[PDB]
């Protein structure tokens, strides 16, 4: 068998984007743009995205050993409704909360920083090969954890590179279909891993 | 037929590079560098590069929903002559206007921003596969538009993902050879597409 083990997985991440704009006498210029994929915590993936289909308007995560907190448009935390992404040929379903990137208002001879947090959730096809100790995603991101890792029936013996607090298993999980706003009638065992740049659920 | 449809295409883009430098008491350090590929508008590709073989010393384009304008060395707009790029084994012809990257002058305990705009034009080999609804370039950049898209003889029915204003077709186009400074004796139906990061002509 040379075909890699293929299984369905769902990614959850926020495209944190803070840009620096220089406002001249008659023009505007980008002095710097910092793009980062902030992962979504288990509490938000369960109690906000799966439970209500909404994402927090702020991105709280650890980056370079610092607890960074990004606010969309520098506004207070607010529940943003998830909507389907733009149509694309040969692409899996995906949803996002924001479309337009935010930049600061125009003030003369001054630098300003405008943060943008766009919650994004996508359904990606995961692949794995023998010894099945790790798997990749459709976006090309590697996940150093066995797809069968878990706490039940000896699954804890599988390979894992992340800390214990970075993995969570939920039993009787009813997947919420964001497009048709429906709830699966089959309780499923859902695994959750919070990678440094994204959160995957399979 | 498994061989992808191969055709010649020309890319046009400007390497906008603005760097932040911190000048210490006895040293210099880069506090941040922002590199971006600004596309070249149709007016410049026709009236400046093809018509006269020169590129504007400024990069005006849309990035993250903002009309950013970058000036080379923070100087006024000027016509820069295009010259061949450095020799490289197994590489297609390419030309550029600037070689040395610009940085701000040294002023003590102060941060400074120096913008660099280097117009770049290259001949790349484009490839496409069935249904031929999109094609890639030698640089690995995808172009979500059918290579045969156009306004003539039913070509408008081909697939396209960009807006109408982002595509332009020119009839009787005489390609200007920047190296031998020659004009082709054969009129061609040149197609032009302004992608968010570059402009391709085939």
């Amino acid at each position: 068998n040379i075909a890699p083990y293929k299984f369905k997985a769902t990614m959850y991440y926020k495209d944190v984007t803070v840009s620096q704009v220089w406002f001249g006498h008659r023009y505007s210029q980008f002095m710097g743009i910092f793009e980062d994929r902030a992962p979504v915590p288990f509490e938000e993936v369960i109690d906000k995205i799966n439970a209500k289909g909404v994402c927090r308007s702020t991105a709280k995560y650890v980056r370079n050993n610092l607890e960074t907190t990004a606010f969309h448009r520098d506004d207070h935390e607010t529940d943003m409704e998830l909507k389907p992404a733009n149509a694309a040929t040969r692409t899996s379903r995906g949803w996002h909360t924001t479309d337009l990137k935010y930049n600061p208002s125009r003030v003369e001879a001054f630098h300003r920083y405008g943060t943008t947090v766009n919650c994004i959730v996508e359904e990606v096809d995961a692949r794995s090969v023998y010894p099945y100790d790790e798997f990749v995603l459709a976006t090309g991101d590697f996940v150093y954890m066995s797809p069968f890792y878990g706490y039940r029936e000896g699954s804890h013996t599988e390979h894992t590179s992340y800390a214990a607090d970075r993995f969570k298993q939920v039993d009787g999980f009813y997947a919420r279909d964001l497009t048709t706003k429906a709830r699966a009638t089959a309780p499923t065992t859902r695994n959750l891993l919070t990678t440094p740049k994204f959160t995957v659920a399979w | 037929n498994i061989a992808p449809y191969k055709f010649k295409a020309t890319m046009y883009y400007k390497d906008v590079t603005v760097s932040q430098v911190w000048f210490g008491h006895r040293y210099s350090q880069f506090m941040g560098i922002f590199e971006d590929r600004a596309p070249v508008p149709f007016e410049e590709v026709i009236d400046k590069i093809n018509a006269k073989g020169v590129c504007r010393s400024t990069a005006k384009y849309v990035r993250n929903n903002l009309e950013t304008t970058a000036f080379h060395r923070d100087d006024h707009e000027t016509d820069m002559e295009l010259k061949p790029a450095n020799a490289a084994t197994r590489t297609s012809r390419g030309w550029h206007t600037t070689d040395l990257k610009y940085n701000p002058s040294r002023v003590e305990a102060f941060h400074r921003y120096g913008t660099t705009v280097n117009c770049i034009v290259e001949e790349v080999d484009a490839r496409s596969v069935y249904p031929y609804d999109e094609f890639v370039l030698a640089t690995g950049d995808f172009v979500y538009m059918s290579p045969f898209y156009g306004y003539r003889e039913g070509s408008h029915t081909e697939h396209t993902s960009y807006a109408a204003d982002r595509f332009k077709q020119v009839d009787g186009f005489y390609a200007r050879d920047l190296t031998t400074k020659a004009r082709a004796t054969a009129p061609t139906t040149r197609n032009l597409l302004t992608t968010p990061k570059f402009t391709v002509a085939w």
Partner: peptide
């Protein structure tokens, strides 16, 4: 898929200015 991110999760033509 990676290059389709901008066209799928963001507006490419809308311009905002003040």
């Amino acid at each position: 898929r990676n290059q389709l991110h901008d066209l799928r999760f963001a507006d490419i033509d809308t311009v905002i200015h003040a």
